[PDB]
Amino acid sequence: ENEIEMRICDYLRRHGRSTVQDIFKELKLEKSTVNRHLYSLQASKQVFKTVEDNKRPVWNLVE
Amino acid sequence: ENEIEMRICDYLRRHGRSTVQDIFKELKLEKSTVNRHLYSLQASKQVFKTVEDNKRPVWNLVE
Amino acid sequence: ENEIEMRICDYLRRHGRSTVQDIFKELKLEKSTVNRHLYSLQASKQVFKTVEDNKRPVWNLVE
Amino acid sequence: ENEIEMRICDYLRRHGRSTVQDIFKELKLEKSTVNRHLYSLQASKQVFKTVEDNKRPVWNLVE
DNA sequence: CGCGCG
DNA sequence: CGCGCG
DNA sequence: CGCGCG
DNA sequence: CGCGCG
């Protein structure tokens, strides 16, 4: 869904840097569904993640 | 859902030993949703898994 | 231990805002031991936490 | 440790049904360490727990 | 799952 | 407060 | 890649 | 436990 992806991006717009756990609980979606879409949005240069060791990746909007 | 759990158990009744991947594609559910319910059904002695090394656990009905 | 508490505070000095999960894996201590000391250091005004909903508390040095 | 697990099982052999709180104070270990091992021993069919509502699980030796 | 809790 | 969870 | 985890 | 994986 474009709706899921809009809702994820809108969460990031309002909250800035967030983990998938942040996003799925607020949106009431499965974690795996939010992650599928985050990775897809990353591939499409709409969001990006930063990672450190085994930590939760942290997501934000590009630019 | 009792409906999800019924549908999982019904899959195992007809197919015997199965991996989560077997079950979620047929049922058209998320893998994580089917696994949540398999682990819950295992706790309630309705299904059991066998595991070997890092292999996919294989699930079946108890008795 | 004063040593544990020094090591926790030193982690926070170098890393800033961190969760207990950040700290226990680097320090190789139990999560519960690091949390016991974080709560104790908070009571002694040496660190503070900020919390939002059910999120991981995030810890940092006072001042 | 096999030593921790031996010590936990030995506690249960002598005391029968016990909570984690019973076991960690006598053994002078962290509660989380004793629970990690109880859950692991349960998976290996060496101990079992019974649970009722939100009560402390109660542990004993299998058979 | 936030948990530190003795 | 059940929590084991990595 | 085993992952269920809240 | 990082996991998105089809």
Residue numbers in the entry:
A (entry chain B), B (entry chain B), C (entry chain B), D (entry chain B): 7 to 69
Direct quotes from the study:
In the form that belongs to the tetragonal space-group I422 the two binding sites on the same DNA molecule are related with crystallographic symmetry resulting in the presence of just half the DNA segment in the asymmetric unit and the appearance of a continuous DNA helix throughout the crystal lattice. Overall, the two structures are superimposable in regard to their primary interactions with the nucleic acid and they mainly differ for the distribution of Zalpha molecules along the duplex. Modeling of the alternative Zalpha arrangements on a long Z-DNA duplex shows that the 6 + 3 arrangement observed in the tetragonal form is the only that can propagate along a continuous helix without leading to protein-protein steric clashes as seen in the crystal structure. Based on the two structures, we created models of all possible arrangements, and we found that the tetragonal structure denoted as 6 + 3 represents the only arrangement of Zalpha domains that can propagate uniformly along a DNA helix without leading to protein–protein clashes. Although other arrangements may occur, as we see in different Zalpha crystal structures, the tetragonal arrangement is expected to settle at equilibrium with a long DNA helix. Based on this arrangement, we evaluated by modeling which of the possible pairs of Zalpha domains could represent the double Zalpha domain of PKZ, DAI and ADAR1, by being positioned in a way that they could satisfy constrains of a C-Terminus – N-terminus linkage between domains. We found that among the possible pairs one is topologically preferable, as it can accommodate a non-structured but geometrically possible poly-alanine linker, 15 residues long (two domain interactions).
Unexpectedly, several fish species encode a PKR like kinase in which the two dsRNA-binding domains are substituted by two Z-DNA-binding Zalpha domains. PKZ interacts with CpG repeats, the DNA sequence that is more prone to adopt the left-handed helical conformation of Z-DNA. The protein was crystallized with an oligonucleotide forming a self-complementary (CG)6 DNA duplex with a single T base overhang and resulted in crystals belonging to two different space-groups growing under similar conditions.
